[PDB]
Design a protein around this ligand. Sequence first.
Ligand code: NI
Length: 193
Amino acid sequence: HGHHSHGKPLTEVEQKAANGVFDDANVQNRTLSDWDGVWQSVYPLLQSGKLDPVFQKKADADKTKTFAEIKDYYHKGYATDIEMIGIEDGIVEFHRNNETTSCKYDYDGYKILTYKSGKKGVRYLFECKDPESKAPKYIQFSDHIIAPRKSSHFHIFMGNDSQQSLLNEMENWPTYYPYQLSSEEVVEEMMSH
Ligand code: NI
């Protein structure tokens, strides 16, 4: 200590929401600034073998999967060449093999998704309307939050076809944690929930 936590403790309603249990009437619009900061892809952590304990734990609990099946699922899930994303002043900047593209994204609302389990998630949609940018036309953030609050980590869906295409995406879900975390810290956070 230090001060090891951040930031306000979750209310019971927020903890349920973070776990996919919420009333649609409680979902609110957010702005891009909820994702401000500098963000690291988790994919190299998978590749370095640092996430192997996450996968083994799962393989043990699940009689129907092997470690190899589980790790391959996450390999495809996290795979991206966008090692770092920077968000500031309304602009998303994607770093991809030390090459950057960026756009000042426009917000396009949220979409509430329901799963066969009964649980739900919220996607926050943005669109690039800058004809000079090479950044993806459509992006969506998915994190544990349904109302204005700074994100702890997220999936970001990206493409040039439609928002619906991203709502439907099952196989690839590039995932990002705060850049300043140690790999150990990222693994702890992944493991924590
Ligand atoms: Ni999470």
